Amino acid sequence: RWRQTWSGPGTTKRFPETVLARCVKYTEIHPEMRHVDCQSVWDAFKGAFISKHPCDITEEDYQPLMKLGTQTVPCNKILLWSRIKDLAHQFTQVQRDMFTLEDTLLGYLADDLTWCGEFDTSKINYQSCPDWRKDCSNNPVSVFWKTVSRRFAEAACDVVHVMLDGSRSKIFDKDSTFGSVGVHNLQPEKVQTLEAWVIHGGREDSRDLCQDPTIKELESIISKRNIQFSCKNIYRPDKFLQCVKNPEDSSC
């Protein structure tokens, strides 16, 4: 067929087997998650979206999965990000101290995957899935990330860090998961400071992007929640990672 139902790419091929193997791999590696039955995790993940209209997904749909994926993360070591995925993960892979959402069981299971079902059947739809923008925002993928990003934001305390892509015209974007979910779910009783790291798009020799209008916006929103705002430019992300791997020595 030359026309699919939805505008988004369909479910990642071998979704069941991929999620299940990711669950095995994660629970083998991370000792705190050793009790976790992966078949049950798969069962609950399925239950959230199978036989349900892929434009009528709710956070409740994912609560059984959230229960099984209950995980304590060091609340003062949380790294959020927006758009600038790869440096965030490369950073935490060396700084095995800070944690992104994808360093948790639930984020690790879903990272870069797409999935949806159909109301009329228990079939997984490998042909197409709702686009958040063209089709509906209550779809299995978008609702999953909203639910898990909210809980992750709520667990943070002390200094929370966020990496932003400073080569976007909207370095801070009110419409990203970070801007719509993360910023509004940090708990002012616990979170002392949000510190933004503005990742430069290379170039070299460049602007203080902590003065960018959208950063002033972020600063204002955060300050009015009674949380301190801090910002740092990361001019050379290639040198940053190098300094993380080899603190001091040369030009760090």
Active site members: 75, 157
> Which of 38, 41, 66, 101 touches ligand NMN (CB under 6 A)?
101
206-235: contacts with ligand NMN (CB under 6 A): none
Q: Which stretch binds ligand NMN (CB under 6 A): 24-32, 38-46, 96-104, 203-211?
A: 96-104
| Conformation bin of residue 141: beta by default, left when phi > 0, alpha when psi is -120 to 50 | alpha
- Determine contact, residues 99/74, Cβ cutoff 8 Å: yes
Binding footprint of ligand NMN, residue count (CB under 6 A): 16
- If the CB atoms of residues 111 and 131 are measured against ligand NMN, the closer one turns out to be 111
**Does 145 sit near ligand NMN (CB under 6 A)?**
yes
3-62: contacts with ligand NMN (CB under 6 A): none
x/- map, 158-177, ligand NMN, by CB under 6 A: ------------------xx
> Which of 112, 189, 248, 249 touches ligand NMN (CB under 6 A)?
112
Read off the amino acid at residue 68.
Answer: L
In the DSSP assignment, the letter for residue 59 is G
**Three-state secondary structure string covering 178-228:** HHHHHHHHCCCCCEEEEEEEEECCCCCCCCCHHHCHHHHHHHHHHHHCCCE
> Which of 27, 71, 100, 125 touches ligand NMN (CB under 6 A)?
100
- If the CB atoms of residues 100 and 147 are measured against ligand NMN, the closer one turns out to be 100
> Which of 19, 68, 99, 102 touches ligand NMN (CB under 6 A)?
102
Shortest CA distance to 183 belongs to which of 208, 143, 152?
A: 152
Helix (H, G, I), strand (E, B) or coil at 46: helix
Residue 178 beta carbon to ligand NMN: minimum distance, rounded to whole angstroms: 4
> Which of 5, 98, 111, 132 touches ligand NMN (CB under 6 A)?
111
Alpha-carbon distance of 167 to 204, in angstroms, equals 12
- If the CB atoms of residues 46 and 161 are measured against ligand NMN, the closer one turns out to be 161
- If the CB atoms of residues 126 and 145 are measured against ligand NMN, the closer one turns out to be 145
Gapped junctions in the chain, after residues (C–N > 2.5 Å)? none
In the block, tokens 């002392």 appear at: 192
Q: Strands 128-129, 8-9: parallel, antiparallel or unpaired by DSSP?
A: antiparallel
- If the CB atoms of residues 81 and 229 are measured against ligand NMN, the closer one turns out to be 81
x/- map, 61-90, ligand NMN, by CB under 6 A: -------------------xxxx-------
Site residues (vs ligand NMN, CB under 6 A): 80-83, 100-102, 107, 111-112, 145, 149, 176-178, 182
